Amino acid sequence: ARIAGINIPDHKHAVIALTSIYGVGKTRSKAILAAAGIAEDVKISELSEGQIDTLRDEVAKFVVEGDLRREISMSIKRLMDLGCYRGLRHRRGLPVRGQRTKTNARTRKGPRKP
Amino acid sequence: AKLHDYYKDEVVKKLMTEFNYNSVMQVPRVEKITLNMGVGEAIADKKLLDNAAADLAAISGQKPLITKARKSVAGFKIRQGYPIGCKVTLRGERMWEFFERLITIAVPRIRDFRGLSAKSFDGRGNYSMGVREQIIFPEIDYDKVDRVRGLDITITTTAKSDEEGRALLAAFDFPFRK
Amino acid sequence: RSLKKGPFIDLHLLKKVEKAVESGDKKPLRTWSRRSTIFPNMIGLTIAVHNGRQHVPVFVTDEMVGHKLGEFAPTRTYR
RNA sequence: CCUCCUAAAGAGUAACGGAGGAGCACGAAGGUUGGCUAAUCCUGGUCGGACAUCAGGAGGUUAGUGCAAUGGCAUAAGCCA
RNA sequence: AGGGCUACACACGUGCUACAAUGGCGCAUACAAAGAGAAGCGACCUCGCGAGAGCAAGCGGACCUCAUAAAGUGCGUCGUAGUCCGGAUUGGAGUCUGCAACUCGACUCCAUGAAGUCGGAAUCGCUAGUAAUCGUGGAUCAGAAUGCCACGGUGAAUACGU
Ligand SMILES: [Mg+2]
Ligand SMILES: [Mg+2]
Ligand SMILES: [Mg+2]
Ligand SMILES: [Mg+2]
Ligand SMILES: [Mg+2]
């Protein structure tokens, strides 16, 4: 089921499947179950109607999918358009966590640019 | 004629006093929705067009009108034929009925909608805005659908000015943003 | 920015910036306390932050507060 | 061999005068019946931006014409079935 | 005083962690050595998701503290998937050390979840409690160890021959 949108995890346990929802990890997923009244081993797919209904209803609290990936980029901009070292880093494809650039950074900049 | 009736009834008179028109046979009416969904690309795939077709035929209650190429000298390329989309205007009944599935189940079936544009107007007074992305509304298997979509929509009212174009639509349930 | 509880800043900028609050905006503020957090009192004020070379025309802004006057003045010259 | 100028407002006229094309192409690109009308710009529209398709306005043979040029073409000689 | 030595389009050496099922994850749970400590180690209980904070005992130390070893063993789950693999990156919010955490600290929480599917030519160490693998302590030190020095658990293969 859409649950939060598109994402339709099946077979996998409710917990490990719920995580598929863009914006939740082992924590948010493991809690949403009990909080809603669902086991862990329970297969989201095999689950009965209500056993999937509450999910959506409760996951509506925390932000997910779009909104997240959406506003998440806004926060990145807020500082970029600001002009602080942080933002400045992004508009330069350089690490903000204060790492070393002279070496190791392929994840930030990318593969060699010889 | 669901919304249609509402027009003559609620609307019209509303404008007849807000615009003080002399004759009822003047009050701007709803002059067919147009739609389009310019498939563009096509060229290589071509299938994304037929898909866009049904994907369009789904929305509109009629049959998609696959267009061609006017210039045939597109900057990109494109030849004389080279299909690029499918307008598919609306017909009175289906038109207003569509004006229903829309504004009530289209814009409402948002994606992140928090207000509709108010400048989609024109000169003579005709609004036309592109959904930017097919809201996946009542389409063949909402989830089991074709890759994205996105299309345009033009109302083209019989108004003489965008100003008056505001009354219309707004006289209905046009989401807008104020 | 981790400072647990208590937005820290240098006494210098404080006594100086406060004067700006009343006297109103005017000339910049030659300061080296780039490690001091920006406050809403200096909001949109004419300040100046060092960076090894010299000072830079730093002006406070709305959201530009919980930050340090330094994270707005780049130091190292790069191409 | 074809088109324009030279050619002096009928035809026609020269040069190692100035310019450019033909040696084909279509069973439809022919016949007919029925229907249609551009180019270009302005405004507004998902991805569409200089220009893909959609909408409205201005505009009016500035489009189009299988291939040169001249002449012609809207009752279309242009376009679709 | 502030900045720089932490610059980054690159290349080379030394390492850490991965590419998973001889594994991951949950719960239960067994065995060790060697060391450190009054401007320190700091329990107990209280609060906190956690880092950590409050109160405050004990120990200058085979008394107390750092300190409830990991692999492992049982059960269960996963099902060979770029996958409950792997964690880089980054975003939001915090703890603490010190005047002072922008430049440039360590760590915690939620979220994000890249490359990576065992690596060319070439090349390194190791002959036994060794290699491999798994944890533990210390020096320096307010606070920045995958480095260095050191400790113990488990525990191989192969050696005709020059
Ligand atoms: Mg003559
Ligand atoms: Mg004559
Ligand atoms: Mg150095
Ligand atoms: Mg110590
Ligand atoms: Mg230490």
Swiss-Prot record, chain A:
Located at the top of the head of the 30S subunit, it contacts several helices of the 16S rRNA. Residues 93-114 are annotated as: Disordered. The keyword Cell membrane does not apply. PROSITE patterns: RIBOSOMAL_S13_1, RIBOSOMAL_S13_2. This is Small ribosomal subunit protein uS13. It comes from Escherichia coli (strain K12). It holds the Pfam family Ribosomal_S13. The keyword tRNA-binding applies. Keywords: Ribonucleoprotein, Ribosomal protein, RNA-binding, rRNA-binding, tRNA-binding. The gene is rpsM. It comes from the Bacteria. Belongs to the universal ribosomal protein uS13 family.
Swiss-Prot record, chain B:
One of its GO terms (molecular function) is structural constituent of ribosome. Signal peptide: none annotated. GO terms for cellular component: cytoplasm; cytosol; cytosolic large ribosomal subunit. GO terms for biological process: cytoplasmic translation; ribosomal large subunit assembly; translation. Keywords: Acetylation, Ribonucleoprotein, Ribosomal protein, RNA-binding, rRNA-binding, tRNA-binding. It holds the Pfam family Ribosomal_L5_C. The modification N6-acetyllysine is found at residue 2. PANTHER family: 60S RIBOSOMAL PROTEIN L11-RELATED. Identified as a multicopy suppressor of the slow growth phenotype of an rsgA (yjeQ) deletion mutant. This is one of the proteins that bind and probably mediate the attachment of the 5S RNA into the large ribosomal subunit, where it forms part of the central protuberance. Its 5S rRNA binding is significantly enhanced in the presence of L18. In the 70S ribosome in the initiation state was modeled to contact protein S13 of the 30S subunit (bridge B1b), connecting the 2 subunits; the protein-protein contacts between S13 and L5 in B1b change in the model with bound EF-G implicating this bridge in subunit movement. In the two 3.5 A resolved ribosome structures the contacts between L5, S13 and S19 are different, confirming the dynamic nature of this interaction. HAMAP family: Ribosomal_uL5_B (MF_01333_B). Part of the 50S ribosomal subunit; part of the 5S rRNA/L5/L18/L25 subcomplex. Contacts the 5S rRNA; cross-links to the P site tRNA. Forms a bridge to the 30S subunit in the 70S ribosome, contacting protein S13 and S19. Belongs to the universal ribosomal protein uL5 family. This is Large ribosomal subunit protein uL5. It comes from Escherichia coli (strain K12). The lineage of its organism: Bacteria, Pseudomonadati, Pseudomonadota, Gammaproteobacteria, Enterobacterales. The gene is rplE.
Curated annotation (Swiss-Prot), chain C:
One of its GO terms (biological process) is cytoplasmic translation. Transmembrane segments: none annotated. Pfam families: Ribosomal_S19. It comes from the Bacteria. SUPFAM superfamilies: Ribosomal protein S19 (SSF54570). GO terms for cellular component: cytoplasm; cytosol; cytosolic small ribosomal subunit. This is Small ribosomal subunit protein uS19. It comes from Escherichia coli (strain K12).
